[PDB]
Design a protein. Structure first.
Lengths: 405, 405
C-alpha cells in the first residue's frame, strides 16, 4: 500500500491554504475523491446520461446498466445476499429515517422499547425520539464504560423482552470506538428485537460483512468513503423490507396506480421513488471499485498505524485531553486545556491544517464527556505520519501561543 | 440564441448510436448537461470539497459559501422572497412527499378534500392517496376537457369549502398542457385551500415567478433543467414552512438535542437533515447560471417554435394520433395506428433517435386517453427542426415497415 501513489490520485490534496501545504485531517466530516471517481461522473455526463429503467434507447440502456451495476457492486462490497436488500438513498441519515418511519412507526406500541447508546450521532437518535413519541413507546440508553466503550453486560441489562429495536453505531465519529455489533445483534435477537446499525464511519475504513454481523439494517454514506455527495445506502434483510411499506411514494416505485389505490414494485425499487440518484450511485460504485483495489484490510491496517502513532504523539503534549479508548478507528477527538476548540481549529487552519470543532452531531455524548465542544482530527487512506507530526507540532505552538497572551 | 453554439457546449450530443448521429428527443425524461455544469462538479471535487456549515477551515468555508450561494441563485431564479423558502431535496418527488407528510398529514381531517387532476404524474398522485388514507380525508379529481386542458369552471366546481389542498402540474409531461396555475391558486385560496404546484416540467423550459403565481408550494428537479441528478428544490411560503414539522430528523437540522426531546434549526435548514447534496446543489446553481445567460424567455420561444413545427409535421403523417392541445410545451406524445409504442421506440433507436414509450408515470391519464401506452418525443434548448424532420421521416418509414410485414 503505497501512500505516495494513493495521494497522487487525489487532486484536491495538492494545494496550499494560507501559504502552507494543505493538511486535510477532517475525513470523518467528509472524504476527498480520487480521479477514478471524479472521471466516472464526467464520463457519465459526457457520454451516457439518460433516465433509467424501461430502457428503449441505447443511452437509456447504458445508464440503466450503470445504475443497477453499481447496486450489485454495493451488494458484493457489504456481502448482502441480494440486490433486493440494497436501497439507494441520499445518505445514512435518510436511510435511518426510512427505518424509523417504515419499520419503527409500524411496529411499536405502548410498552415497547427502542434502545440506543449515549455515543450515537443525532442521525441515530432523533428519528427514534420521533418514532417513540409517535407510537407511545419508550426510548432507553445503554450506558458507556469510563473509556467510552460499551460492555455487553450493560447491553444485556438494557435490552429486555419489551425491546423491539436496538440502534447503535458501528464506529463512533467522536470516540473512535468500534462497537461489538455482531454480539449486540445476538443479544437483540435473543430478546425478540431487530438491530439497526449506523455504519457511516465504519464502511469507509473497514470491511463490512452484513451476513457475519447478522445486522437487520445497516446504513452508510458515499461521501465518507471516497464517493460523491448526496448518496447513501440502506441495507435491510429482505424478509423485513418485504413487510415494510415505502417511506416515499411516486413514479418508479409503483406497479399499478388507480385513482385512489396503488400497488408497489418488488424490492429494491419499492423504496426508490422518482428518478434516482443516477450519477452519484454510479460514482459510489467507482469508489467501491477503487477501495477494493487498494484493499479495505490494507486501509484498516494503515489507519490503525496512524491512530496508534497519533495517540502516542498526543500523550507527548502537556495539557491535552483525548476522549475514548486506546483501541480505535482512525480519529482523535481532544481538547487543549484552557483553549476553546474553535480557536484551536482556527489557528490550525492558519497553518494549512483542516480539523473540525464542535459537538460533531453528538450533543448527549458531549454532555456525557462533561464538555461543551471538542476538536477532532480524523484520518483516511491518503494521510501520513508526517501530517500527524504537523498537527502535534501546531498544537504545541497553539498551547504556547495562548499561554503568552 | 444560436443553436450551433449551444449544442457545442454539450459533449454527449456529439456521438453516434447504431451508426447514426444521435438524435436525443427524450429531455422530458432527463436533460443533458453543458460543460459549464460538468466542470462545476469537477472543480468542486478537485479543489474545495469539504463538509458545510460550522466553517473552521478554508476548504469548509469555500464549500459552505458554494452551497448557500447556490441556494440564493435558486431563490432569485424562481423569485422567492427568501432563502428560508428554498429547501434542497433529492428531486421533485421527494419535495412533494415532504409536503404530503409534513403539511397534509398534519392538516387533514375526515371531511377535508385534496383535489388533484387526471393528468397528474404519479409523484403528484400517490403521496396524496397516502395522506388521505392516513387522515380519513377524501381525494377528488378535477376533470379534463376533450383536448386535455383544464377549465377554470371545472376547478371552481371541484374545489369546495372543504378543500384543504389543491395539487396540480404546472406543465404536463404527457399532454404538454400548460395549466392555469395563477388562476387556480386564486380559486384554491378563495376556498381556504393551499395550492401545491408540481413544477418538474415547467422550471427547465420557462420563467417561474412564485410571487406572481402565488403558489403555496412549488417543486422542481435539477436533472430536467441541465443540472446534476439527485437534487431538487421544495419552495414553500415561509409562514407555511414555519408551522410544518420536519419530514426527516438528524444532525444539521437541530438546535438542541436532549436524551428524549430536540429542537429544530430555523428555516431552511430545519428541512435539511444530514450532510446535504453539496456538489449537486452547487452544480444546479451552475445550471441556473447557464440557463439565465441564454435567457428562459429565449428558451421558451425556441421550444414554442419546435413544438409548432413538430405538430404541423405530425399532421402530415397518416395513421398517427397526437394527444393534448395545440398550445403546448416542447413535447409531443403520440401513437402510430397499429404499432405498439415500444416497437416505435425500438426502431427509432436503430436510427439513432432516442424517444420514450410507456405510461410516462401517468397511468390514470393513459386510462383517460383510452390507451395502454404512448410514445413521446420531447425537446429542449439543444434540439433543432432538422432533428424533428429526422423523427417524422423515421415514423413514416416505421409505418411502411410494419405495413410490409
Amino acid at each position: 500500500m503505497n501512500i505516495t501513489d494513493i495521494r497522487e490520485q487525489f487532486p484536491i490534496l495538492h494545494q496550499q491554504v494560507n501559504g502552507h501545504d494543505l493538511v486535510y485531517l477532517d475525513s470523518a466530516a467528509t472524504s476527498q475523491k480520487p480521479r477514478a471517481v471524479i472521471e466516472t461522473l464526467d464520463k457519465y455526463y459526457n457520454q451516457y446520461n439518460s433516465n433509467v429503467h424501461r430502457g428503449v434507447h441505447t443511452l437509456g440502456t447504458r445508464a440503466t446498466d450503470g445504475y443497477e451495476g453499481a447496486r450489485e457492486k454495493v451488494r458484493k462490497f457489504i456481502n448482502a445476499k441480494s440486490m433486493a436488500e440494497i436501497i439507494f438513498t441520499k445518505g445514512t441519515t435518510t436511510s435511518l429515517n426510512m427505518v424509523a418511519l417504515s419499520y419503527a412507526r409500524a411496529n411499536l406500541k405502548p410498552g415497547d422499547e427502542v434502545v440506543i447508546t449515549y455515543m450515537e450521532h443525532h442521525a441515530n437518535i432523533i428519528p427514534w425520539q420521533q418514532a417513540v413519541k409517535a407510537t407511545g413507546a419508550t426510548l432507553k440508553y445503554i450506558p458507556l464504560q469510563e473509556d467510552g466503550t460499551i460492555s455487553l453486560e450493560d447491553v444485556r441489562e438494557t435490552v429486555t423482552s419489551n425491546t423491539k429495536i436496538v440502534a447503535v453505531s458501528h464506529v463512533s465519529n467522536v470516540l473512535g470506538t468500534v462497537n461489538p455489533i455482531k454480539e449486540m445483534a445476538k443479544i437483540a435477537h435473543d430478546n425478540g428485537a431487530v438491530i439497526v446499525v449506523d455504519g457511516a464511519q465504519s464502511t469507509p475504513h473497514m470491511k463490512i460483512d452484513v451476513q457475519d454481523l447478522d445486522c437487520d439494517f445497516f446504513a452508510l454514506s458515499s461521501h465518507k468513503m471516497c464517493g460523491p455527495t448526496g448518496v447513501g445506502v440502506l441495507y435491510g434483510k429482505k424478509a423485513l423490507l418485504e413487510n415494510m411499506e415505502p417511506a416515499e411514494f411516486g413514479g418508479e416505485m409503483i406497479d399499478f396506480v388507480g385513482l385512489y389505490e396503488s400497488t408497489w414494485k418488488e424490492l429494491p425499487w419499492k423504496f426508490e421513488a422518482g428518478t434516482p440518484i443516477i450519477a452519484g450511485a454510479i460514482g459510489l460504485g467507482a469508489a467501491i471499485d477503487f477501495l477494493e483495489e487498494i484493499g479495505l484490510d490494507e486501509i484498516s491496517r494503515h489507519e490503525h498505524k496512524l491512530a496508534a502513532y497519533a495517540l502516542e504523539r498526543f500523550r507527548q503534549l502537556d495539557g491535552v485531553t483525548v476522549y475514548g479508548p486506546e483501541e480505535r478507528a482512525g480519529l482523535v477527538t481532544f481538547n487543549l486545556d484552557d483553549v476553546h476548540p474553535h480557536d484551536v481549529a482556527t489557528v490550525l487552519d492558519a497553518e494549512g491544517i483542516a480539523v473540525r470543532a464542535g459537538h460533531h452531531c453528538a450533543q448527549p455524548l458531549m454532555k456525557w464527556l462533561d464538555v461543551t465542544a471538542t476538536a477532532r482530527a480524523s484520518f483516511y487512506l491518503y494521510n501520513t505520519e508526517e501530517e500527524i507530526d504537523k498537527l502535534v507540532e501546531a498544537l504545541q505552538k497553539t498551547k504556547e501561543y495562548f499561554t503568552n497572551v
